[PDB]
């Protein structure tokens, strides 16, 4: 989807794309997209920009650019969201969490999950760090 | 020629209870002491596979599917017994009435044993040495026991019999026996009864890696005691013929044919 | 061995493949396995 990006960075991408608009129609070629994409900070290799045209002729528009930028940021966002969301679960934030504490805090995340589900979840596995929880839930 | 192992006859094969025996040694050679399954194949050093669970006190080794360091070497006397409990499937050894710890310290590390077809006391002897078994047929002669035994639930292997345990051993003297049709690398079969070729027996082999072979001194099964074509000559003749054919790829330099 | 003193980068392959150097305990007492030659 394209709903994982906030409005301000969408605005930044729109400004970056419009600043080098060809004739106002948003039609740009393969050489210039690398320049505009390296203009705002991200400077990767040539392979990904070779495969971008493969996923979608020499006619590149703003929607395709936004979709590919969105789904190359979304993988990093998803890979990183599994570490920050655990920060609240442990008091110090390092990763150590008592098994007794979760008995009354892990049943109130808003998912309407009662005691039985967490019984089966924690029984199927002391203090457990974050990576063991990653293996525990991601599977 | 190398070892002379000893065992009990396989109708004392035991499948439930708690049993014991002790061993007595004079010298300090190479002794194998332990339990064994009834299908003890000779010509094989015991403890090299799953057939027998054995302990060697010469170098502090226990053998099952290979050696393992366990216990200290011997001294003179060497009064050693064998614990056994099929309820929890555990085997323990005791030296001079003292259990031997494991590498990190445990109960002989021999655990999770299947009942199968029961077990037998077994004992071997290296050259020149002497052993003295005691299956416990009289309790005064059993020397230490007491400290181990009574106050944990045990009694010895032969505790209540009016006649002593018969025993077996490996002879060494080779004897002929029919070839078992499960011999890794040896295959024999009957060929045919065709008009041209007469009935004949052939052999085979697995000529490759893995293993090899030596000289198979084979011999057929029967006899020919001595005696004490025209239809005339063939019904009065006393002289008969057999034949072998060495095939190609076999050197007649390493072939001997005749009578035994 | 090669460049044991060149790339002073702390995050280089030297600090990464440092365990690859220990991967040589396979050779027993082969201290006298061969002579001494190079290029």
């Amino acid at each position: 989807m394209a709903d994982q990006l906030t409005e301000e960075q969408i605005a930044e991408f729109k400004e970056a794309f419009s600043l080098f608009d060809k004739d106002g129609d948003g039609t740009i070629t393969t050489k210039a997209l690398g320049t505009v994409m390296r203009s705002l900070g991200q400077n990767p290799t040539e392979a990904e920009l070779q495969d971008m045209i493969n996923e979608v002729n020499g006619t590149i528009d703003f929607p395709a650019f936004l979709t590919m930028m969105a789904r190359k940021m979304k993988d990093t966002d998803s890979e990183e969201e599994i570490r920050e969301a655990f920060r609240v679960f442990d008091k110090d934030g390092n990763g150590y969490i008592s098994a007794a504490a979760l008995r009354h805090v892990m049943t109130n995340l808003g998912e309407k999950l009662t005691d039985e589900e967490v019984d089966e979840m924690i029984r199927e596995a002391g203090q457990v760090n974050y990576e063991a929880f990653v293996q525990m839930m991601t599977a | 020629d190398r070892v002379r192992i000893f065992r009990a006859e396989k109708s004392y094969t035991v499948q439930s209870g708690r049993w014991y025996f002790e061993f007595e040694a004079v010298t300090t050679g190479e002794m194998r002491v332990g339990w064994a399954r009834p299908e003890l194949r000779p010509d094989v050093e015991l403890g090299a596979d799953e057939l027998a669970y054995v302990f060697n006190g010469h170098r502090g080794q226990r053998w099952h599917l290979g050696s393992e360091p366990f216990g200290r070497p011997w001294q003179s006397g060497d009064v050693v017994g064998c614990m056994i409990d099929l309820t929890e499937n555990t085997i323990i050894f005791t030296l001079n009435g003292e259990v031997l710890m494991s590498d990190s310290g445990s109960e002989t590390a021999f655990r999770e044993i299947e009942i199968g077809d029961g077990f037998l006391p077994v004992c071997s002897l290296g050259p020149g040495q002497v052993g003295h078994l005691n299956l416990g047929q009289d309790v005064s002669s059993l020397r230490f026991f007491a400290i181990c035994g009574l106050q944990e639930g045990f009694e010895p292997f032969a505790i209540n019999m009016q006649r002593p345990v018969t025993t077996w051993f490996s002879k060494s003297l080779p004897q002929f026996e029919p070839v078992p049709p499960e011999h890794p690398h040896y295959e024999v079969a009957r060929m045919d009864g065709t008009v041209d070729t007469p009935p004949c027996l052939r052999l085979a082999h697995r000529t490759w890696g893995s293993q090899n072979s030596l000289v198979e001194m084979l011999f057929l099964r029967l006899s020919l005691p001595v005696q004490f074509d025209d239809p005339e000559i063939i019904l009065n003749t006393t002289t008969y013929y057999y034949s072998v054919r060495v095939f190609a790829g076999q050197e007649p330099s390493c072939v001997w044919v005749g009578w035994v | 061995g090669v460049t044991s003193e060149e790339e002073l980068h702390l995050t280089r392959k030297l600090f990464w493949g440092i365990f690859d150097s220990l991967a040589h305990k396979k050779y027993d007492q082969e201290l006298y396995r061969m002579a001494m030659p190079c290029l």
Partner: protein
């Protein structure tokens, strides 16, 4: 490169090469330009080039580059190979290995109480320390070099009556000294540095305020395995001329320290001010039982521990001997030739104290068992303090174990009675850890920073000796008592019920297979005075012990994601 060629090109091209020289030797055309050279030594030689450098290129500028990276790659690799082999010291012995230990020791000097960067080299030295601890020794004098900084280190105590030389330089020092054990070269001027350290440390415990560390105080005991000035007249100062049976060694305190300890034991000595020096040097008084065979003065070895036990019988306080209990390791060696056949009072000293401890624990357990008036304020009183007695209990039990690992033969043989008192009073955990005392079970810190760990594990060693004096014929009722205790019938409330159980029945199998030996090994008595009690002893005892060994011994591919 050619060194990495296949077996096909290393057998035929060499033949194409070996025979050419053989053709050269034809007609007299000779052109010349399995000795254990050891690649390991060549690696050491490759290390020698780095060792010959090292301080030659770094300390020439450090004490006054990309080259400062090889040390962070080779030093880490040396911690493995040295610990991987650990068997090179058996066959092809070479002193070249011992050279690198000293060649690096000089490089490890510079600031043998400070330095910089990494301190793992000290740990790397500890790894090479195991490798060491005819020619043997030669150009080194490391021991002589060890006497250098260690000399003024004795004045360091007077310089506060040197800060990591008692740590780093004392690490491998206390290590290699205690790692010796097996081999033993000699003692050339070692006692000179020792007496300059021993007598210096023998009175270094008088300086208050800064008492420094007691770690190196155990290093004197660690080095107590060399040979034979407090009183070294013909051994120290008056011995610069040039070692037979000089009947004089630790005889300066043979009966003196014995009388001193006896007087120290006679006194209460229930304070940190007590022992002090002895608390940091009398642990080396047990190392004297080495060269003296087992113990020629057997009574001395049968009292030194007893007097030491009296110090333990004095009983500490809250914290008190919190760190002053790590000397129990040496105590597990004084029981070697423990000919304590006497015991009796010493046995009672281990019994009555434990019984007093059992009474003290009962005074704490019942103070927690009979206190359920809804108040968490007792958690500081009932609990917490339980850990104080717990850590105290985990001190005497580590001594009685080895004591029972020798007093079991004659004890279980002949008769009993003696150890019967210990077995009857061994219901400590039975009246605690097995008595559902969660607090006593809450070792926690005692379980962590001080499963299966003593407490009841010690009872297993004498459990057989406990049932040894039990039924010498008909048991049976014990099984009925086991079922009775399983129904939770208090304690004495079951004995009265056990008193009404007809009689002991046995007249079939077994019996003559078992009680026949008991009818020849017992020879004591037979009456109705026993009844339960002796039968009610191991009944409820092994009952809870059995319970301790009984039972005691979803989400689709989608919902999953969401939870994250």
């Amino acid at each position: 490169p050619y060194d990495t060629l296949t077996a096909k090109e290393k057998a035929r091209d060499r033949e194409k090469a070996q025979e050419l020289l053989k053709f050269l030797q034809m007609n007299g055309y000779a052109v010349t330009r399995l000795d254990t050279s050891s690649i390991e030594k060549r690696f050491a030689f490759g290390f020698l080039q780095q060792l010959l450098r090292w301080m030659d290129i770094s300390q020439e500028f450090i004490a006054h580059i990309k080259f400062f990276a090889k040390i962070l790659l080779p030093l880490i690799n040396q911690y493995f190979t040295n610990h991987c082999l650990y068997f090179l010291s058996t066959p092809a012995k070479v002193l070249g290995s011992g050279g690198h230990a000293s060649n690096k020791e000089k490089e490890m000097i510079t600031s043998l109480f400070c330095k910089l960067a990494a301190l793992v080299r000290h740990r790397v030295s500890l790894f090479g320390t195991d490798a060491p601890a005819v020619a043997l020794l030669p150009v080194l004098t490391t021991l002589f070099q060890h006497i250098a900084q260690h000399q003024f280190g004795d004045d360091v105590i007077l310089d506060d009556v040197c800060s990591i030389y008692s740590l780093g330089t004392t690490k491998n020092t206390y290590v290699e000294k205690l790692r010796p054990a097996l081999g033993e070269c000699l003692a050339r001027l070692a006692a000179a540095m020792p007496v300059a350290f021993l007598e210096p440390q023998l009175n270094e415990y008088n300086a208050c305020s800064v008492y420094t560390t007691k770690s190196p105080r155990e290093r004197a005991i660690l080095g107590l395995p060399n040979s034979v000035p407090d009183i070294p007249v013909l051994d120290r100062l008056m011995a610069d001329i040039g070692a037979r049976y000089t009947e004089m060694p630790h005889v300066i305190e043979i009966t003196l320290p014995m009388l001193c300890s006896y007087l120290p034991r006679w006194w209460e000595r229930g304070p940190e001010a007590p022992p002090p020096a002895l608390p940091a040097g009398a642990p080396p008084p047990c190392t004297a039982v080495t060269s003296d065979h087992l113990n020629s003065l057997l009574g001395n070895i049968l009292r030194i521990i007893v007097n030491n036990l009296g110090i333990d019988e004095a009983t500490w306080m809250k914290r008190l001997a919190v760190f002053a209990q790590p000397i129990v390791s040496r105590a597990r060696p004084e029981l070697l030739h423990s000919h304590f056949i006497p015991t009796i009072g010493r046995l009672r000293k281990r019994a009555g104290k434990v019984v007093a401890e059992e009474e003290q624990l009962r005074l704490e357990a019942k103070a927690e068992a009979e206190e359920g008036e809804l108040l968490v304020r007792d958690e500081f009183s009932v609990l917490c303090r339980d850990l104080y007695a717990l850590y105290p209990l985990l001190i005497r039990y580590v001594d009685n174990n080895r004591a029972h690992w020798l007093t079991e033969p004659n004890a279980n043989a002949e008769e009993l009675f003696r150890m019967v008192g210990e077995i009857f009073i061994y219901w400590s955990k039975s009246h605690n850890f097995k008595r559902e005392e969660q607090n006593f079970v809450v070792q926690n810190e005692i379980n962590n920073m001080s499963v299966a760990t003593l407490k009841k594990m010690l009872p297993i060693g004498l459990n057989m000796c406990a049932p040894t004096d039990q039924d010498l014929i008909m048991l049976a009722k014990t099984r009925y008592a086991l079922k009775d205790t399983d129904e939770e019938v208090r304690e004495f409330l079951q004995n009265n019920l056990h008193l009404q159980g007809k009689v002991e029945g046995s007249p079939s199998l077994r019996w003559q297979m078992a009680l026949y030996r008991g009818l020849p090994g017992r020879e004591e008595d037979a009456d109705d005075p026993e009844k339960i009690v002796r039968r009610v002893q191991e009944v409820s005892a092994v009952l809870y012990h059995l319970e301790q060994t009984e039972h005691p011994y979803l989400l689709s591919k989608q919902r999953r994601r969401a939870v994250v």
